[PDB]
From a paper:
The B. bacteriovorus open reading frame Bd1204 is predicted to encode a PTP of unknown function. Bd1204 is both structurally and mechanistically related to the PTP-like phytase (PTPLP) class of enzymes and possesses a number of unique properties not observed in any other PTPLPs characterized to date. Bd1204 does not display catalytic activity against some common protein tyrosine phosphatase substrates but is highly specific for hydrolysis of phosphomonoester bonds of inositol hexakisphosphate. Phytases are a group of enzymes that catalyze the release of orthophosphate from Inositol hexakisphosphate (InsP6).
Bd1204 crystallizes with two copies of the protein in the asymmetric unit. The peptide chain conformations are extremely similar with an RMSD for Cα atoms of 0.31 Å. Bd1204 adopts a canonical PTPLP fold with a central 5 stranded mixed β-sheet of topology β2/β3/β10/β4/β9. The central sheet is flanked by 2 α-helices on one side and a 5 helix bundle on the opposite side. Importantly, the β-hairpin at the top of the phytase domain between β7 and β8 has a large deletion in Bd1204 that results in the partial β-barrel that is present in both PhyAmm and PhyAsr adopting a much more open conformation. Additionally, a Ω-loop between β2 and β3 that is present in both PhyAsr and PhyAmm is absent in Bd1204. The deletion of this loop results in a significantly shallower active site in Bd1204 relative to PhyAsr, (depth of 7.7 Å versus 14.9 Å, respectively). A comparison of the electrostatic surface potential of Bd1204 with PhyAsr reveals a significantly less electropositive active site in Bd1204. Examination of the catalytic motifs reveals that the general acid loop (D177H178) and the P-loop (HC206RAGKGRT) adopt the same conformation in Bd1204 as that observed in PhyAsr and PhyAmm, indicative of a conserved catalytic mechanism. A notable difference within the catalytic site of Bd1204 is a peptide bond flip between K210 and G211 that results in the carbonyl oxygen pointing towards the catalytic cysteine.
Residue numbers in the entry: 33 to 293
């Protein structure tokens, strides 16, 4: 597999968007695997954190929330917000550190007292703050919606997985809870189970669990803008299976090293 270099141009205008459906006390597109001790959802509110934490609840520290979002986001008046541009490609030119810095900068540019339409800002919070206040752990990856992760972010993921305590529970989310979230549930499952389970079985159980049946499907139309991105994602997950089979739980070699053999 090649070293992965292609990417989209970032989109504009970027606008702060209040994600009102994500403000509900239950997380959207939620699903879980008790055997893998993993779950996935859309980005969620302060009140929904207790729901996400249920499978762990008497062991708060063992929940690790993996935020997969490249685009910037946070909480204003407990409402999840996104700095949105088309396809959530606002930050598509930024590497991980740049994307993390950009989100800090945009949240810092908000002020208590600002009026954005009918909203008067009274509370500004990072998502990490909200997660950690609940006694849980937080890991940020930066993945572009519709695009596979870059190799170094896959390594970042693996390094985080290798450092997990026994009996960690991992919860993935992205803005919609489909696409990126499903892919990393697949990658996590392969890290643990590629050594014993088939590629097709792993894809099958995760598409079914996530009601995300076209996560890896390549459009029939080659002029559909998603076509090259889906081809890339498919190649990536197909080779990741081979890596994870050879290096269960990332033992002995990271993905990045594997690619550059
Ligand atoms: Mg709050
Ligand atoms: Mg640059």
């Amino acid at each position: 597999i090649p070293f992965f270099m292609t990417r989209p141009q970032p989109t504009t205008p970027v606008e702060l968007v209040f994600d009102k459906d994500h403000a509900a006390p239950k997380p959207m597109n939620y699903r879980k695997s008790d055997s893998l001790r993993m779950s996935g959802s859309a980005t969620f509110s302060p009140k929904a954190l207790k729901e996400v934490a249920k499978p762990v609840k008497k062991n708060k520290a063992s929940l690790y929330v993996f935020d997969l979002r490249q685009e910037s986001h946070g909480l204003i008046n407990d409402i999840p917000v996104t700095w949105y541009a088309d396809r959530d490609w606002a930050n598509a030119d930024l590497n991980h550190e740049e994307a993390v810095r950009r989100e800090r900068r945009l949240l810092g540019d908000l002020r208590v007292g600002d009026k954005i339409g009918t909203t008067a800002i009274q509370s500004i919070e990072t998502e990490e703050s909200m997660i950690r206040t609940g006694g849980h752990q937080y890991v940020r990856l930066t993945v572009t919606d519709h695009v596979r992760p870059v190799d170094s972010e896959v390594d970042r993921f693996i390094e985080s997985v290798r450092a997990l305590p026994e009996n960690a529970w991992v919860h993935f989310h992205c803005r919609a809870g489909k696409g990126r979230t499903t892919t990393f549930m697949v990658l996590y499952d392969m890290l643990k189970n590629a050594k014993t389970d088939s590629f097709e079985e792993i894809i099958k159980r995760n598409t079914e669990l996530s009601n995300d049946y076209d996560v890896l499907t390549v459009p029939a139309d080659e002029k559909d803008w998603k076509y090259p991105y889906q081809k890339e994602r498919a190649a990536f997950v197909t080779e990741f299976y081979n890596y994870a089979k050879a290096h269960p739980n990332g033992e002995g070699m990271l993905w990045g090293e594997w690619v550059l053999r």
